Amino acid sequence: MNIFEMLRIDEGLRLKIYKDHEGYYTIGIGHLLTKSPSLNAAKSELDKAIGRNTNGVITKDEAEKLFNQDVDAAVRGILRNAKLKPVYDSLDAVRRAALINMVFQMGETGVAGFTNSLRMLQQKRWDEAAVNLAKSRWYNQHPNRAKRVITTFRTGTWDAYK
C-alpha cells in the first residue's frame, strides 16, 4: 500500500464542488478550495487551480493532478519544518505515511502544534502517542479516519487499511 492509496481511501474522490464536513468547499481528493461561504469564490479558486473555465466540475485526471501537487506540498512542508523534519526522519516507511496523511489534512502548521505527540513519536512511545493523539478536536471530528491513522502509527502496518 502507499500514501497515495491511503489518502485516496481517507478522502475519497468527488468531481463536482462540494461542501465538506465543516461546510467548506472542496473537490477532488480532499482538495480544499476555500473556507469561504461564496460558492463563487470556490468556483474561482477552482478555475484558477485547473486553468480553465470549470463551472465546478472536473475531470478525474485533473483531480489526480491536484492530488499529486497536494501530496507533494505536504512533504515539502514536513521537510521545511524544524519540528516535523526530525520526527519524520526518525520514522519508518509506514509511519511516515501516517505523518504525511496528517500534514495533508491539517497542514504543516496544525500538525507541528501537537508538541507532545511528536515527542512521543520521536521516542517511539507508540502506545502513549496514540493515546495522546486521540485527545484532540481532530479525532473527535474525524473518529473513523483519525482511528486508522493513529492505528497506523501504533502498529507500523497497513492493517487499518485492509
Binding residues for substrate are: 32, 104, 117, 132
Distances (CA, A) of 60 to 13, 26, 63, 66, 119: 8, 15, 5, 10, 39
- Residue 142 interacts with Cl ion (CB under 5 A)? yes
Helix (H, G, I), strand (E, B) or coil at 31: strand
Residue nearest to Cl ion (CB): 144
Q: Could you give the CA distance from residue 147 to residue 101 in angstroms, rounded to a whole number? A: 12
159 among known catalytic residues: no
Q: Which stretch binds Cl ion (CB under 5 A): 2-10, 33-41, 42-50, 86-94?
A: 42-50
Q: How many CA atoms lie within 13 A of 46 on its CB side?
A: 26
Residue closer to Cl ion by CB (options 39, 73) is 73
Active site residues: 11, 20
Q: Write out the residues near Cl ion by the rule CB under 5 A.
A: 49, 142, 144-145
